[PDB]
Design a binder for these strands. Structure first.
Lengths: 225, 547, 57
RNA sequence: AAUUCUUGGACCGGCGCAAGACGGACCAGAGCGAAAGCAUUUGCCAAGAAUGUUUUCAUUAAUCAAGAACGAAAGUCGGAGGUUCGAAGACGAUCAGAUACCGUCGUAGUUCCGACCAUAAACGAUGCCGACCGGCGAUGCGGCGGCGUUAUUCCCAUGACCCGCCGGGCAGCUUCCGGGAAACCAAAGUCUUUGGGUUCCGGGGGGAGUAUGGUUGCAAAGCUGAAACUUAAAGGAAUUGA
């Protein structure tokens, strides 16, 4: 085994973090979510998943937050779905603030460092100016783009795997709306993929009509609203 | 410490654990570093470090067991220093120091086959270093600043292929190898490097001997290229005159005239020879052939560019200039291709080349062929914008264009409703960020070219289109409308008649062109002869087959 | 070697040393049940009280 | 049970210190070594089999009277050491008796250094070298080819597994190869269809590994080694009983 009394995962996770090893602190929490302890949502499963998704953000591992939530949605099925709502809202909330900080960081300290640095065109900046553009995009790619390419991959995975149809989620449409407003702050070529995502998921709904899913008819919420 | 007898026999047992499986790899340079720092005597430390100094920097390329990988910033740095300590001691002691007798020791390496190619073992370090650097550029995120942080080492690499260039004690005839390695770091260099040391007006700005030694390196191509032409056409091998002249052609472009360059392309006959050549040169050809028409475009020739840049952009494999593209077919061979991918900074830009095959055609098609398009179809050139004009017109919705091709169309569609104003104002909208003005390395002048070929190619329009009820017309006011020079309008308005055989009369002492065209409901019965010919032009072809 | 006794105990409370060794030796031969079996105390510095009362909050 | 140890605090628990031994479990029909034998970590010194090789010398080889190196344990002499264990001893029990097995102490010894000793069920109770003669699945070292899994994330390339092949090595299971008195043996086979080369050595059981000489040793004792006399059996494997 790994654990008896699943709350101990938090204590090992917390102990590893005081040393500053968030990779094995995450390994601990990952091992508990996928084990015998599948008892339909213990009160301690929320603080485990809150810490789990905080460390998934701090290390930038979207494919782990996928598996983590994919296990969680299973162990918090119709028992209580408020837990999914609270967890996944708090996940996307945490990722949004990391990108807010990442821009303001790069855009006030490093952006002023960029046009603090001597612009007086040397050979290395002149040579690249037959293909390339400004220094701010050239170094904002180093310190911002890995965070917005994580926000995108966080949103798309939260939509695609987790909430395919599943009637019991108005959160699905909340995320879709929020991620459309995310495209007004950052890149646009991750918005055509977002449209195609809504198109195929709508196509996936009214082709099968084959699970405890969305009946898109007179139903005001899951058709009009 | 003794009579070079305990440094030629401790330099003959630490370059003996070289390559071996228990190499150490790292602390072997340290024992080659602790036979120079504990070498503090003449001919035992201050004479024959040269033979050690060959195998102190040769010990730094072997630190990496692979030849597909690059030296780390730490390793790359110390081997740009240790190549220069070589040159501190081989400059201010003019002689050979892996042989060629002076006294007795520690020189005189005759017993070793040839004390000449162990002496020519400096050109093959600065050639190995020239190629080693290219891997530093191939393995960096090119849209990151870490690319610029590494291109700051390009002032330090160009220096040593110059410091070990002036060095003429070769052992012309046999130096040409370092000449090609030098010109390879000059051939893609731009106007403002090659121009703005000639272009600072030669007076009391640049007319002192060594103030005019920054004036060495604008045409270094004149001197060193002919030396890699008529010694190498006398000598054995092939590679360093095929490569040498294309660097010359490419450098007689983008900051020099067409006529000077195009001659060299046809002298060497690489139009119908570069077929049995190796790929590493077979791309340098493609790179050159593309820059030809790009610089023809720069000066004014807007149909000479077109008919040259067809066979390149025609392909879906338009990445015969750059980092290669898409799907599978032998992966092991596609790893023999990632070691061919040419360096990012050198690359001819692609959103700049697609904007010369929808900006040259637009002036050789939407102008040349809006004459016979009113019911006279048997001159339609079947390779033009209609590649894409059937696409960005077969869309149910358009507005202010965003892409390149619609932003290279929404001024074309008004270049049919001529509007000199409306069409000039949408090749200079938001392209000076998206590579039109900036990228074509001539800051403002390619627009002064474009504007002129917009101003002029829009007076050649009402002539060919809007002439129906136009009988008496004005050719002074036409100069006031569109603002071209009266002679540069008196020429093409004259050309309009003879060159395009238009039905309009002239007495140009008065500067006038009476039309008397009447063809409008007469070309309709001739639009019956578009097909009444294609009845009786067919009876000409019927009995060709019959008998 | 590089940090003080308050932080080495903070490492021994998990088994960060054993997990680090285990992951490091994956290339030579994969180990599994890796721990720091025992810690002994050979020498202490001459007793201080201010240094003790930092460890006791 | 008693001999013995202890209110001059034994045994028990705690913290220190010193000494001299020994290297648990991992440890296997695994490895190395001519055999005896050999196990905590690291460093230094010299050696070695096997594999790999389109390198070299070109019969230099196999087995061996004489002669020579190593040879568990106990034993001997001199030096250092003596924690544990412990021949003789001293007692306490057991018993008809007990000079024994059981117990409490305990000297030589057990350990190291330098000199002798040269024997063991020193065993595979099985000389060494070479050839041929069945099958099968593992195992240790080296090489070779091969789906895929995994660690270096950056995977080339290295290790860990996975599936075969080749050469040496410790063994294993199987069989009308064949042999043998049988037990059993891929050798203990290729033997009346008897010869590949070569060293040592046995001739019914006792007396007897005894006496005597000679030789090596400080001694204990080692190596070589009979005769008179005595006797019809002693013995090896296997079967049925008790």
């Amino acid at each position: 085994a790994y654990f008896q009394r699943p709350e101990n995962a938090l204590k090992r996770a917390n102990e590893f973090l005081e040393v500053g090893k968030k990779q094995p602190a995450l390994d601990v929490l990952y091992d508990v979510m996928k084990s015998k302890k599948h008892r339909t949502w213990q009160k301690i499963h929320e603080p485990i998943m809150l810490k789990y998704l905080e460390l998934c953000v701090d290390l930038r591992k979207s494919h782990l937050a996928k598996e983590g939530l994919y296990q969680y949605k299973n162990i918090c099925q119709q028992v209580n779905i408020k837990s999914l709502e609270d967890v996944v809202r708090a996940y996307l909330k945490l990722a949004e603030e990391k990108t807010e900080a990442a821009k303001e960081e790069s855009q006030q300290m490093v952006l002023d460092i960029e046009d603090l640095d001597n612009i007086q065109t040397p050979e290395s900046v002149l040579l690249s100016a037959v293909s390339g553009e400004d220094t701010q995009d050239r170094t904002d790619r180093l310190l911002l783009t890995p965070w917005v390419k994580f926000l995108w991959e966080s949103y798309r995975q939260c939509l695609d795997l987790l909430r395919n149809n599943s009637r019991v989620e108005r959160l699905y449409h909340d995320i879709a709306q929020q991620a459309f407003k995310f495209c007004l702050q950052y890149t646009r070529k991750a918005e055509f993929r977002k449209l195609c995502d809504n198109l195929r998921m709508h196509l996936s709904q009214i082709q099968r009509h084959h699970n405890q899913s969305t009946a898109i008819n007179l139903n005001n919420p899951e058709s009009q609203s | 410490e003794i009579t070079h007898a305990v440094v030629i026999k401790k330099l003959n047992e630490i370059l003996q654990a070289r390559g071996k499986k228990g190499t150490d790899r790292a602390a072997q340079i340290e024992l080659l570093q602790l036979l120079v720092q504990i070498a503090s005597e003449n001919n035992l430390g201050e004479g024959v470090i040269v033979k050690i100094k060959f195998n102190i920097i040769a010990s730094l390329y072997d630190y990496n067991p692979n030849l597909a990988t690059y030296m780390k910033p730490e390793m790359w740095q110390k081997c740009l220093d240790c190549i220069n300590e070589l040159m501190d001691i081989l400059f201010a002691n003019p002689n050979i120091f892996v042989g060629e007798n002076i006294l007795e020791e520690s020189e005189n390496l005759q017993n070793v086959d040839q004390p000449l190619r162990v002496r020519g073992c400096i050109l093959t370090l600065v050639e190995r270093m020239d190629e080693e650097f290219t891997k530093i550029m191939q393995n960096t995120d090119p849209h990151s600043q870490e690319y610029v942080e590494h291109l700051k080492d390009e002032a330090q690499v160009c220096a040593i292929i110059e410091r070990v260039q002036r060095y003429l004690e070769e052992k012309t005839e046999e130096i040409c190898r370092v000449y090609l390695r030098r010109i390879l770091h000059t051939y893609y260099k731009f106007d403002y490097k090659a121009h703005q040391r000639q272009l600072t007006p030669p007076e009391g700005s640049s007319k002192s001997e060594q103030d005019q030694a920054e004036n060495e390196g604008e045409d270094s191509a004149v001197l060193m290229e002919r030396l890699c032409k008529y010694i190498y056409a006398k000598d054995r091998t092939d590679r360093i005159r095929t490569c040498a002249i294309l660097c010359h052609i490419y450098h007689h472009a983008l900051h020099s005239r067409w006529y000077q360059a195009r001659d060299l392309m046809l002298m060497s006959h690489l139009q119908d020879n570069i077929q049995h050549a190796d790929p590493p040169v077979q791309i340098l050809y493609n790179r050159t052939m593309v820059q030809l028409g790009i610089c023809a475009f720069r000066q004014g020739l807007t149909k000479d560019a077109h008919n040259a840049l067809l066979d390149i952009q025609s392909s879906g494999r338009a990445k015969e200039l750059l980092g290669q593209g898409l799907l599978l077919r032998s992966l092991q061979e596609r790893n023999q291709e990632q070691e061919k991918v040419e360096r990012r900074r050198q690359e001819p830009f692609h959103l700049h080349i697609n904007l010369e095959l929808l900006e040259c055609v637009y002036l050789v098609s939407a102008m040349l062929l809006e004459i016979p398009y009113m019911a006279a179809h048997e001159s339609d050139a079947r390779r033009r914008m209609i590649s894409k004009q059937f696409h960005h017109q077969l869309r149910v919705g358009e507005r202010q264009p965003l892409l390149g091709p619609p932003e290279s169309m929404r001024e074309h569609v008004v270049a049919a409703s001529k509007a000199m104003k409306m069409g000039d104002w949408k090749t200079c909208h938001s392209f000076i960020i998206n590579e039109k003005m900036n990228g074509k390395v001539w800051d403002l002048f390619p627009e002064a070219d474009k504007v002129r070929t917009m101003l002029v190619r829009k007076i050649q329009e009402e002539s060919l289109r809007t002439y129906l009820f136009t009988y008496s017309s004005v050719y002074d006011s036409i100069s006031m409308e569109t603002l071209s020079d009266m002679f540069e309008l008196d020429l093409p308005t004259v050309h309009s008649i003879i060159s395009k055989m238009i039905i309009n009369e002239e007495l140009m002492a008065s500067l006038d062109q009476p039309t008397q065209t009447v063809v409008m409901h007469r070309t309709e019965p001739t639009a019956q002869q578009n097909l009444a010919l294609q009845l009786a032009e067919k009876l000409g072809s019927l009995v060709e087959n019959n008998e | 070697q590089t940090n003080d006794l308050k932080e080495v105990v903070n490492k021994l409370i998990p088994d960060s040393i054993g997990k680090d060794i285990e992951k490091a030796c994956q290339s030579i031969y994969p180990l599994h049940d890796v721990f720091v079996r025992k810690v002994k105390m050979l020498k202490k510095p001459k007793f201080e009280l201010g240094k003790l009362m930092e460890l006791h909050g």
